[PDB]
């Protein structure tokens, strides 16, 4: 049922670029910040799909 | 008789180096390294001058930990009155601090500095095996404050087994404070670091303000005065370990004498025979007024009525220095005729403790030569109101959901704040359920 | 015991080579009379590096000034030190210069440069110990650049396994009014990337800019600007000129300056701003000597300390003072800016101190240091080469004797592959914090 | 240890910034020559917060300033300290302003803001660490609102973990060259309420109202106006640039003052209303001269 | 005891001529050509008069082969301040200089004289039967550097057998030198000179620079003052075979009690009870503070914390001149407390070595009438921080790839650098991980590595 | 994707209830906001299928 | 399949207990809820992170 939803969250994992050695020391900090922001939203969506489907 | 202390926060490092300067000045530990009373360089380790370790060729260092993310505090410490004999290899600091909050220093930016100071704690833990707890200096919002402690107490209670420790929580004062969200960090610190603790006692800066401006008639509310007074008080506390006398019992004996419960956990440190250049000149010292002036409301760290303040314990600490004869005379002159309102269904045995070999008073401070100490470490079940007032202000400010947005995107959720309110309400309502006298 | 001798290639090269050997000989004094002029015999091997003994205690160079238009060689050679040579040199033919790269490189081989390989076969054989030879290669025209790259290509086969001193001169498009500059220079440096050991790309463009816009010189002739570049190259050559506490051979310094031997492009400066033209006689003492060391004014390139990632810096301090304060100020300049922080070879500095003055100003210094703002110079030349390449522009006489499209296509492709690799090395901070292990180890 | 950049904008923001650093160097006196006039030698850190390192104890701001009307900045470069600036601020052209909000917002500014972001990116790392951004930004002109809004946007996607200090001049019905400025206001703070950290409602017709009515000044000019606002914001930011024992840091100011993080428009007033003109020359004691602290008019 | 002395590189030849003229002023070898004390020509034939024996021409010349392809160092050892007191004809010059490039010496520039140095070592190795090893004066990259020491060690281990290979592997200060590439040769040192050796030492240059700029206060931060103090340390170590008597604690048990393991190969040195020429005004002659400032970083060559480096061995050495009973009198001074953190499987006691005959003092330097000394030389795991510093330098340089194309088109290999990295990692883990107390192998259930 | 691209569309279509309220400031302004957070993740994967149809 | 059946089986294996007593064990019950939901989500993301 959510075996495609876990593939969607694995695509959110697949939206991760490499941490860019070819990346300025200010810029891959921004990659890390948008990473942690997007998995904050992903954790909110994860507890959404955990709590809502249990009913 | 060996313990290594850690200090976090700006005011934590301030009280730490003030108290360590007082220690080194009152044991004769000179800035020349050696103590001139004997021929051991750096310091010593005999029975009670045991705040050192054989680091070099007999070289001994005043072992302590000074940690803060803001980097200039260790620089202004290191250019102080005890200049170069602080450790040139463990003064670890960050680059940019959390800047007066909780969440960033705990969850996000401190997560790459917790393991570095943990490795430093492991390297100092490979040293001499004497261990009788800890001595953690922190505040609620001074430097990093709650951000380090809320993680490192859990890390100590998981990584280092079930070992005892002790911590110092600087209770704030809104008349000299620097923040507004202090109910939030106070309630968070109180549900986190107290349930993973072994011993603690809270010192209120507003209590120092009261005993200075309302009991000593001085007109200077500066953190240097607070640092010197905390140095005096913590020196009097540690002087049992620091000097051997008649009842030279360890701090482990104190912490296995005091605490009755995981929730019933906190004392009311009763030491206000207040002194300065004013209230030490041509006075007379006796064992009646300093002991009769304990239970009164204007002598306390946390405010309580004497009849409404119920003493589960009434432990006492004496600096002695003359005789145990007058102390065992005052056990009948003062301590025996004490029919003061007490707690039901608990023993009513008063405790005294005298520690000889005088700690030298502060040089270059304000107080003149003083003798006695009445550091009566009682406890009070009616300190539930002292946090219920903060819970009431937190209720009146928390329904407006103020300052929530700074504490959302750093990992936590609103359930954490509801859990903190639940924990402090549980502690308070447990005190009016069984802590305050019941049936 | 050691020799590096003289040869020339360039229309703007003969004058600067003559003046450069004068200013390295101006405080040494080897006369063409036939007798010795000993005033300080602690530079015996030091003058033997450039002036070799061929008579009774007389030290002469092996100077072969070769020009296809020998009027400059006819005119400027009769100097004080310009006649004390072995006279079997200056092999010359008048087939023409013509400011053309193709016919200079192609048809003028057996006419003159075959005699040039023969004469450097002979003159590198009848001496003590060879370590290469010196040349002031100039890109002022086409024939000089062609004969310089011909000499480089032939000495990579004459003595292949030997470090040999190669220079270059960046032209001045403000002054060089030729209608086509960037063909010969760009294809020449294309060849010289994979044909040499080191390039001290001294220039006439940015030095023209700083003497016209900063020094306020109303007469920007080639004479005083040649004196400027001669003082700069004297400060460069102080490593081999003076016997110090190490007496460092340039064979070691050629390997020292390369982190990887493909890329060997950096130019010096002159930190205390010598006063050729607008004059002053003040003694440049230590804090004013070092205060102008990190400047965006004097360095002979498109100045950008912000666009600076320097790899190896070295300043010879022949002013008589100790190096403790010099090293303290070196640390201050090293740590006060984050552009220099690259952390490869973490002792990438040098402080060499001698006691032999260059000129009447006894205590002074210079600037040599690795150059990283040369990317905009390479782009400023290469994209105005491709500006006049897209429409097959200026094939009037660059249609050479042998012409291909593959040579120009590969020239611009390797130009692209050096500028792109240079900008990849100016970026991708693979030593400071750019790895994956500064923030723990596990971040998915 | 603590560094703040110098990015300015606008045709009025640039001149109020010129007056700003004039009057905050009035108590500093940092010379443009190189004679190293030290204000206080124990304040190397508190000159380094604003005037950053370029040479040995030669401390200059992170001087970058942009507008398309070069006459104003060429006029103010001949000031008291108008020449102590790096030769990197001159990133501009001659396309004209015309009080056009679209060309600063959308069309003309999109081809020039790249150079400004590149120079602040290559100037931000040239210190110990980065702590704060600041900007004197206006709405009286046309281009300034648009390019300031887009610069705040670009610093949001480029430097999220950095504060920015956004002075913002509110429109005026009393002094106005053109009147389209309601459109210059309703789509300027449309996204500024969710793009920056802290803002200022320094008004202009209430400011002219207190300049004219409650002071009785015969100078309705931009000169004394800029004098007053520069003195007021100098007294504001003196706390942030001189941390004695208090006056908490950048995010710390945002922590204790900002609930509901859109409601970040604090109003900077000033008590004594001292002005060039009619002047009061007694030593300002605390109670009867700080009685002008609470009056909302 | 007639060990062959090899000196290559600029530092090797420099301290070779310096230390051998220090032996000349120590053994009385006057610039006349022979001593005025013992009239045997060249040298004596006592137990300690054994470094100087009959090989050259019947004159018992000082015994040291001086080879280096840099010709200026051979010139200034041929034209220094002593012209006949060394080997009169056995010093052979080098023709072409390596000029601060190590990798040329091992593969290209030093291969012409390997046959000549093999002839010299066959000349000087068929000599008198006393040969306990080799007094190698190793260098990294100054002249030829590690090249000739490396080829000599490898062909001496695969051709001469299993003789001891006592090294003085100098790790110089980058401040006073000029090369940058030095981590490459210092990490190829492990591959080409460490495994096939049998015993080694350490001499340094950073601590002498630190005391000369700050503590000793001598305005000479060059190789000359470094030579002046390393001459004292070389005279101190050679005083075991040079001062024979009742307490001749010589090399025989020294080589036994230095090294415990294959890759515990690197000892440490802590000689600094030094009194300067500006302290040479009849100051305090101390036997207490030289015992009290042992583990302080002043005596240590590399600034390391003793609080973290456990010791599997400790070799104490107090060479004085006053009384042989002062051995017992100094045994009963400070040795009783000594609560020093040790490995749980090593002994505790301290050996004692004294040379009670007073020496002859070196003139014209920065030293007073030095008579007594302290040196706590041992193998310590506290050099793991120094080797981690060197490996950090090499990792940064290998990320920068400086002079890689200089150091690959002559005979090296990137896989050879990988194997050198593995050899350096083995020398690390025999001091980092295995070198610390490994008691965590007895047994417990928590989730550890079973 | 390309047939599972509409499977996340039926995932959003499946588990999106009406915003039933629970207390003030909640369940019609912040659960609605986490639903718009889901929609902005949908927008992000729309500009990320913009670049997978590129390949 | 079996993974999501496991995850929802553990979700239904955390029932809400009865409210009874003088509010001692209720805080431990809330802690048990929040923690055990956290590691069931952790097991979910690990299982779907390998696949």
UniProtKB/Swiss-Prot annotation, chains A, F:
Organism for this UniProt entry: Human immunodeficiency virus type 1 group M subtype B (isolate BH10) (HIV-1)
Molecular function terms from GO: DNA-binding transcription factor activity; RNA binding
Major location category of this protein: host cell
Function recorded in the entry: Escorts unspliced or incompletely spliced viral pre-mRNAs (late transcripts) out of the nucleus of infected cells. These pre-mRNAs carry a recognition sequence called Rev responsive element (RRE) located in the env gene, that is not present in fully spliced viral mRNAs (early transcripts). This function is essential since most viral proteins are translated from unspliced or partially spliced pre-mRNAs which cannot exit the nucleus by the pathway used by fully processed cellular mRNAs. Rev itself is translated from a fully spliced mRNA that readily exits the nucleus.
Protein name: Protein Rev
Residue ranges annotated as motif Nuclear localization signal and RNA-binding (RRE): 24-40
Entry PTM: Asymmetrically arginine dimethylated at one site by host PRMT6. Methylation impairs the RNA-binding activity and export of viral RNA from the nucleus to the cytoplasm. The methylation site is still unclear and either occurs at Arg-25, Arg-28 or Arg-29. Asymmetrically arginine dimethylated at one site by host PRMT6. Methylation impairs the RNA-binding activity and export of viral RNA from the nucleus to the cytoplasm.
Keywords, comma-separated and alphabetical: AIDS, Host cytoplasm, Host nucleus, Host-virus interaction, Methylation, mRNA transport, Phosphoprotein, RNA-binding, Transport
GO cellular component terms listed in the entry, alphabetical order: host cell cytoplasm; host cell nucleolus
Effect caused by changing residue 29 to A/K: Decreases methylation by host PRMT6
GO biological process: mRNA transport; protein export from nucleus; viral process
Region (Disordered): 13-39
Stretch list, region Homomultimerization: 8-16
Protein family membership: Belongs to the HIV-1 REV protein family.
Domain of life assignment: Viruses
Location of this chain's protein in the cell: Host nucleus, Host nucleolus; Host cytoplasm
Shown residues within the full chain: 11 to 65 of 116
Composition-biased stretches (Basic residues): 26-37
Documented effect of changing residue 32 to A: Does not affect methylation by host PRMT6
UniProtKB/Swiss-Prot annotation, chain D:
GO cellular component: cytoplasm; microtubule
PTM remark: Some glutamate residues at the C-terminus are polyglycylated, resulting in polyglycine chains on the gamma-carboxyl group. Glycylation is mainly limited to tubulin incorporated into axonemes (cilia and flagella) whereas glutamylation is prevalent in neuronal cells, centrioles, axonemes, and the mitotic spindle. Both modifications can coexist on the same protein on adjacent residues, and lowering polyglycylation levels increases polyglutamylation, and reciprocally. Cilia and flagella glycylation is required for their stability and maintenance. Flagella glycylation controls sperm motility.
Needed cofactors: Mg(2+)
GO BP annotations, alphabetical order: microtubule cytoskeleton organization; mitotic cell cycle; neuron migration
Superkingdom field: Eukaryota
Motif (MREI motif) on chain: 1-4
Cross-link (Glycyl lysine isopeptide (Lys-Gly) (interchain with G-Cter in ubiquitin)): 58
Phosphoserine carried by residues: 40, 172
GO molecular function: GTP binding; GTPase activity; metal ion binding; structural constituent of cytoskeleton
Chief place where the protein resides: cytoplasm
Comment block on domains: The MREI motif is common among all beta-tubulin isoforms and may be critical for tubulin autoregulation.
Function recorded in the entry: Tubulin is the major constituent of microtubules, a cylinder consisting of laterally associated linear protofilaments composed of alpha- and beta-tubulin heterodimers. Microtubules grow by the addition of GTP-tubulin dimers to the microtubule end, where a stabilizing cap forms. Below the cap, tubulin dimers are in GDP-bound state, owing to GTPase activity of alpha-tubulin.
This protein's name: Tubulin beta chain
Organism of provenance: Sus scrofa (Pig)
Full-length numbering of the shown residues: 1 to 297 of 445
From Swiss-Prot, chain E:
Catalyzed chemical reaction(s): GTP + H2O = GDP + phosphate + H(+)
Residue positions, PTM Phosphoserine: 438
BP term (GO), one: microtubule cytoskeleton organization
Residues carrying 3'-nitrotyrosine: 281, 450
Assigned keywords, A-Z: Acetylation, Cell projection, Cilium, Cytoplasm, Cytoskeleton, Flagellum, GTP-binding, Hydrolase, Isopeptide bond, Magnesium, Metal-binding, Methylation, Microtubule, Nitration, Nucleotide-binding, Phosphoprotein
Domain of life (superkingdom): Eukaryota
UniProt-listed Enzyme Commission number(s): 3.6.5.-
Maturation and modification: Some glutamate residues at the C-terminus are polyglycylated, resulting in polyglycine chains on the gamma-carboxyl group. Glycylation is mainly limited to tubulin incorporated into axonemes (cilia and flagella) whereas glutamylation is prevalent in neuronal cells, centrioles, axonemes, and the mitotic spindle. Both modifications can coexist on the same protein on adjacent residues, and lowering polyglycylation levels increases polyglutamylation, and reciprocally. Cilia and flagella glycylation is required for their stability and maintenance. Flagella glycylation controls sperm motility.
Active site as annotated: 253
Compartment(s) where it occurs, according to its Swiss-Prot or TrEMBL record: Cytoplasm, Cytoskeleton; Cytoplasm, Cytoskeleton, Flagellum axoneme
5-glutamyl polyglutamate carried by residues: 442, 444
Protein's UniProt keywords contain Transport: no
One CC-aspect GO term: cytoplasm
InterPro entries found in the cross-reference section: Alpha_tubulin (IPR002452), Tub_FtsZ_C (IPR008280), Tubulin (IPR000217), Tubulin/FtsZ-like_C (IPR037103), Tubulin/FtsZ_2-layer-sand-dom (IPR018316), Tubulin/FtsZ_GTPase_sf (IPR036525), Tubulin_C (IPR023123), Tubulin_CS (IPR017975)
A single MF term (Gene Ontology): hydrolase activity
Obligatory cofactor(s): Mg(2+)
Note: The highly acidic C-terminal region may bind cations such as calcium.
Entry similarity comment: Belongs to the tubulin family.
Protein's name in the database: Tubulin alpha-1A chain
Gene: TUBA1A
């Amino acid at each position: 049922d959510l075996l495609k939803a876990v593939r969607l969250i694995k695509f959110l994992y697949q939206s991760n670029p490499p941490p860019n050695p070819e990346g300025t020391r200010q810029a891959r900090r921004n990659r890390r910040r948008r990473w942690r922001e997007r998995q904050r939203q992903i954790h909110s969506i994860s507890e959404r799909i955990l709590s809502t489907y249990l009913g | 008789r060996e313990c290594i202390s850690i200090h976090v926060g700006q005011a934590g490092v301030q009280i730490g180096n003030a108290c360590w300067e007082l220690y080194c000045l009152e044991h004769g530990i000179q800035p020349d390294g050696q103590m001139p009373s004997d021929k051991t360089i750096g310091g010593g380790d005999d029975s009670f001058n045991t705040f050192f370790s054989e680091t070099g060729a007999g070289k001994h260092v005043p072992r302590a930990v000074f940690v803060d993310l803001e980097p200039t505090v260790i620089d202004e410490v290191r250019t102080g009155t005890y200049r170069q004999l602080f450790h040139p290899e463990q003064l670890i600091t960050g680059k940019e601090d959390a800047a007066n909050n909780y969440a960033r220093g705990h969850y996000t930016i401190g997560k790459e500095i917790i393991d570095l100071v943990l490795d430093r704690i492991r390297k100092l833990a490979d040293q001499c095996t004497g261990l009788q707890g800890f001595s953690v200096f922190h505040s609620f919002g001074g430097g990093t404050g709650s951000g380090f402690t809320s993680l490192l107490m859990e890390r100590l209670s998981v990584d280092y087994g079930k070992k005892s420790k002790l911590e110092f929580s600087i209770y704030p004062a809104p008349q000299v404070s620097t923040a507004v969200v202090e109910p939030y960090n106070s309630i968070l610190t109180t549900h986190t670091t107290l349930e993973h603790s072994d011993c603690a006692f809270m010192v209120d800066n507003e209590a120092i303000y009261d005993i200075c401006r309302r009991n000593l008639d001085i007109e200077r509310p500066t953190y240097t005065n607070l640092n010197r007074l905390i140095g005096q008080i913590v020196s009097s506390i540690t002087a049992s370990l620091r000097f051997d006398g008649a009842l030279n019992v360890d701090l482990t004996e104190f912490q296995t004498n005091l605490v009755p419960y995981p929730r019933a956990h906190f004392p009311l440190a009763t030491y206000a025979p207040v002194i300065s250049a004013e209230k030490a000149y041509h006075e007379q010292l006796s064992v009646a007024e300093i002991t009769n002036a304990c239970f009164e409301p204007a002598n306390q760290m946390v405010k309580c009525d004497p009849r409404h303040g119920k003493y589960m314990a009434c432990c006492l600490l004496y600096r002695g220095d003359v005789v145990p004869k007058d102390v065992n005379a005052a056990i009948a002159t003062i301590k025996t005729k004490r029919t003061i309102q007490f707690v039901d269904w608990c023993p009513t045995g008063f405790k005294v403790g005298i520690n000889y070999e005088p700690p030298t008073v502060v040089p270059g401070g304000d107080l003149a030569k003083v003798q006695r100490a009445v550091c009566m470490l009682s406890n009070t079940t009616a300190i539930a109101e002292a946090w219920a007032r903060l819970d009431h202000k937190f209720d009146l400010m928390y329904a407006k959901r103020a300052f929530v947005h700074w504490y959302v995107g750093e990992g936590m959720e609103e359930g954490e704040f509801s859990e903190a309110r639940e924990d402090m309400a549980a502690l308070e309502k447990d005190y009016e359920e069984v802590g305050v006298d019941s049936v | 015991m050691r020799e590096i001798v003289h040869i020339q290639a360039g229309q703007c090269g003969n004058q600067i080579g003559a003046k450069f050997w004068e200013v390295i000989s101006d405080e040494h004094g080897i006369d063409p009379t036939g007798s010795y002029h000993g005033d300080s015999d602690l530079q015996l091997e030091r003058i033997n590096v450039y002036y070799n003994e061929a008579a009774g205690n007389k030290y002469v160079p092996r100077a072969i000034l070769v020009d296809l238009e020998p009027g400059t060689m006819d005119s400027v050679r009769s100097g004080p030190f310009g006649q004390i040579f072995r006279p079997d040199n200056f092999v010359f033919g008048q087939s023409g210069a013509g400011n053309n790269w193709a016919k200079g490189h192609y048809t003028e081989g057996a006419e003159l440069v075959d005699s040039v390989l023969d004469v450097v076969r002979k003159e590198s054989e009848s001496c003590d110990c060879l370590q290469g030879f010196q040349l002031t290669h100039s890109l002022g025209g086409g024939t000089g650049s062609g004969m310089g790259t011909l000499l480089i290509s032939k000495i990579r086969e004459e003595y292949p396994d030997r470090i040999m001193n190669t220079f270059s001169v960046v032209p001045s498009p403000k002054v060089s009014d030729t209608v086509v500059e960037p063909y010969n220079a760009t294809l020449s440096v294309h060849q010289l990337v994979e044909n040499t050991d080191e390039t001290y790309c001294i220039d006439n463009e940015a030095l023209y800019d700083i003497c016209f816009r900063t020094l306020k010189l109303t007469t920007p002739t080639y004479g005083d600007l040649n004196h400027l570049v001669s003082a700069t190259m004297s400060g460069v050559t102080t490593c081999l000129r003076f016997p110090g506490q190490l007496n460092a051979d340039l064979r070691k310094l050629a390997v020292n300056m390369v982190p990887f031997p493909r890329l060997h492009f950096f130019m010096p400066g002159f930190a205390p701003l010598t006063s050729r033209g607008s004059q002053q006689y003040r003694a440049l003492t230590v804090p004013e000597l070092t205060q102008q060391m990190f400047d965006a004014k004097n360095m002979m390139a498109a100045c950008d300390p912000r666009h600076g990632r320097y790899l190896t810096v070295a300043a010879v301090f022949r002013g008589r003072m100790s190096m403790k304060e010099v090293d303290e100020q070196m640390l201050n300049v090293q740590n006060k800016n984050s552009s220099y922080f690259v952390e490869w070879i973490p002792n990438n500095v040098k402080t060499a101190v001698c006691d032999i003055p260059p000129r009447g100003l006894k205590m002074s210094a210079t600037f040599i240091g690795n150059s990283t703002a040369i990317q905009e110079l390479f782009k400023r030349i290469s994209e105005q080469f491709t500006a006049m390449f897209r429409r097959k522009a200026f094939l009037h006489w660059y249609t050479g004797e042998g012409m291909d499209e593959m040579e120009f296509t590969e020239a611009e492709s390797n130009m692209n592959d050096l500028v792109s690799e240079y900008q990849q090395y100016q970026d991708a901070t693979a030593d400071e914090q750019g790895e994956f292990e500064e923030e723990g180890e596990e971040d998915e």
